[PDB]
Design a protein around this ligand. Sequence first.
Ligand code: ATP
Length: 381
Amino acid sequence: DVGTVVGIDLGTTYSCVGVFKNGRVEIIANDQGNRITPSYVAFTPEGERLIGDAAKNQLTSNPENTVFDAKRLIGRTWNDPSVQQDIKFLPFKVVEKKTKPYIQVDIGGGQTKTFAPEEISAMVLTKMKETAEAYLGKKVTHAVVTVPAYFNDAQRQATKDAGTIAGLNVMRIINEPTAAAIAYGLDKREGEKNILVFDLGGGTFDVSLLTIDNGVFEVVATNGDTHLGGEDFDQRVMEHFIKLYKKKTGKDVRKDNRAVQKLRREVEKAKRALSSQHQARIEIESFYEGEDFSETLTRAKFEELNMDLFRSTMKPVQKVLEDSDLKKSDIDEIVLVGGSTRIPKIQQLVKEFFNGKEPSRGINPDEAVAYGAAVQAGVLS
Ligand SMILES: Nc1ncnc2c1ncn2[C@@H]1O[C@H](COP(=O)(O)OP(=O)(O)OP(=O)(O)O)[C@@H](O)[C@H]1O
């Protein structure tokens, strides 16, 4: 009565859903062709609710009615210090309702709705559910959904409630780094091993020490930085290309937000390209005042702009080892998670930190959490 159960990585910035089919984990692509889906929701002036790429690609000078980063708010109270800090940086409205941080948006034609953070995330989970059902060709009722290891009781329960709203019975909550370890089959291994998970995504950086013993995972310690990810690498490059365009012409592109938003879209695309190549083409038509945008970024310029940010990721790692009474030599397994660990520099920096030890290779870092949840989901029928 559980049918085909789905594994869902419910991401701050991007979500992934996988499933076990014909003896194999399959990561499923969305109706836009992508194996990851933005954790974004938007409400058009007409009233169309967009979820995913369409929400994130859709452009206006209306940041107020596009919702994202609900994972920063999920399971938290309005008066939580983290919530107070985060809403300062969020362009949509957040109000106290039922003791919680509700999102307030215009739903179309000046009509206001408030959504609990778990209601926003249910919209995202509804998207993943549709993605899986389209691929499977049948309905889905049950999910394994992952959460960060530091997630507490109310955050875990709120993630289950998002599922309930989305029409999924979240059968199991699994910690994200455990699911990555599982994707690499690290619970098969005999003996006791020490597992370091370095998980650098779009908005957050998480480091976790796991211990495995005959299939049994224990989170020994967690560290990181909640406001460090791929997005912050994007910002550095936008500032370089905004201060290159001023000291070229004389103008200021920040005087118009729609241009800024297009530059973002393209800087992001180039950054990814630069994980494969040594230069990228940034090209946007009638960028600002009809005048056009064609510029190029090198791999090495990207690293130079972000080097201090790349190096900062090592201090939380040292901290995890400290807090767990371990030294670099006691790590049997290094696991890289998150789309930002596709960056050549990051990978170089981890391997030198571990004095040349190779990390697990083989699953798209992007996908490893959804994949491992799909391994557990597979067994569950
Ligand atoms: N090939 C690539 N090279 C460089 N960066 C990439 C690549 N692919 C994806 N990224 C970046 O990774 C980030 C998204 O990471 P991920 O998909 O792990 O998000 P997430 O699960 O929501 O994580 P978080 O919750 O930490 O934001 C984005 O900033 C994106 O630009």
